[PDB]
Write a protein that binds this ligand. Structure first.
Ligand SMILES: COc1cc(CNC(=O)c2cc(Cn3ccn(C)c3=N)cc(-c3ccc(F)cc3C)c2)cc(OC)c1
Length: 303
């Protein structure tokens, strides 16, 4: 069992926080918010660094490039924006979605961006020019998450339509559709850090680990509450091998990845913990909550 303890509480956003992500170099934390702003924080001390402004409506998601020099953000204003973190400059504004943009990620080479939208499509963008390269008619309901695998050859997407799908990056072809017995909305998905599995959340209070090549669900993690919101989930690999997820009972849940037992719950937020992130080298967890709370909390552990 880990021993996560609250170290810092981060206030500054004036509306619901939508996403938190640690930079891959471990130095920074980025946060997005319905207040239309991105904020950067020191990852180890929680000290506020700067605000990045530009979107016209709330920001749903933010993600780092591999070298921690760029961010991409997805917004209700139907754009994505690519930011140079050091200068604060908006480098490109990606226009092409016909509805709110919900989720985004760079590929490992950080030469591409993938996005998912309420327009039920997944789009692939060129980082250097900012132009849309492919539009994939991915789903028949809003796209809840998009993520590249370890080498960037695949994209996984999830949707309220109940499907997880695996896409070939180069051709845009659907390679696999995954779904379990019930057809609950799929509210989050991502590849494992070694790229062999996908971790999928469904709006029936369930996280599932899938062998996607074999199309088999290996493990399930339960005990949290998730019936309404698209909540991030994470692999924690710096100490013990855990699963981390926020919850609609205002807690952060931590499971043992292999045995699936709950090993810790983290108490402190006053609203749905919509987003969590795991530091890439230290046993640090960032958690963020919705409109009744508006804060980000940083937790640290021995293992
Ligand atoms: C059919 O109706 C639906 C209803 C919902 C309900 N929305 C959410 O749950 C939700 C979840 C997150 C967390 N987040 C962000 C990216 N990723 C991958 C996440 N997991 C953020 C926000 C948000 C967006 C804009 C904003 F200004 C402020 C906030 C807090 C809303 C989702 C839906 O599918 C897309 C279809």
């Amino acid at each position: 069992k880990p021993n996560y303890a609250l170290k810092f509480t981060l206030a500054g956003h004036t509306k619901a926080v939508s996403s938190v992500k640690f930079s891959p170099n471990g130095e920074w934390l980025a946060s997005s918010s319905a207040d239309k702003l991105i904020k950067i924080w020191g990852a180890y001390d929680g000290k506020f660094e700067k605000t990045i402004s530009g979107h016209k409506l709330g920001i749903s998601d933010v993600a780092w490039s591999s070298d921690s020099n760029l961010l991409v953000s997805a917004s209700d204003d139907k754009t994505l924006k690519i930011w140079d973190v050091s200068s604060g400059k908006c480098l490109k504004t990606l226009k092409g979605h016909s509805n709110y943009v919900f989720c985004c990620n760079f590929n490992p080479q950080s030469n591409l961006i993938v996005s998912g939208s309420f327009d039920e499509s997944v789009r692939i963008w060129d980082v250097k020019t900012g132009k849309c390269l492919k539009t994939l008619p991915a789903h028949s309901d809003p796209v809840s998450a998009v993520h590249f695998n370890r080498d960037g050859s695949l994209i996984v997407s999830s949707s309220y339509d109940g499907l997880c799908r695996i896409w070939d990056t180069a051709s845009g072809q659907c390679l696999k559709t995954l779904i379990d017995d019930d057809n609950p909305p799929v509210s989050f998905v991502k590849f494992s850090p070694n790229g062999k599995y996908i971790l999928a959340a469904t709006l029936d209070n369930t996280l599932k680990l899938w062998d996607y090549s074999s199309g088999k669900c290996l493990k399930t993690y339960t005990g949290h509450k998730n019936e309404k919101y698209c909540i991030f989930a994470n692999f924690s690999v710096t100490g013990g091998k855990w699963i981390v997820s926020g919850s609609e009972d205002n807690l952060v849940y931590i499971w043992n990845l292999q045995t699936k037992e709950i090993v810790q719950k983290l108490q402190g937020h006053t609203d749905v913990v919509i987003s969590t992130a795991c530091h890439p080298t230290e046993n640090i967890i960032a958690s963020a909550a919705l409109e009744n709370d508006k804060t980000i909390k940083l937790w640290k552990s021995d293992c």
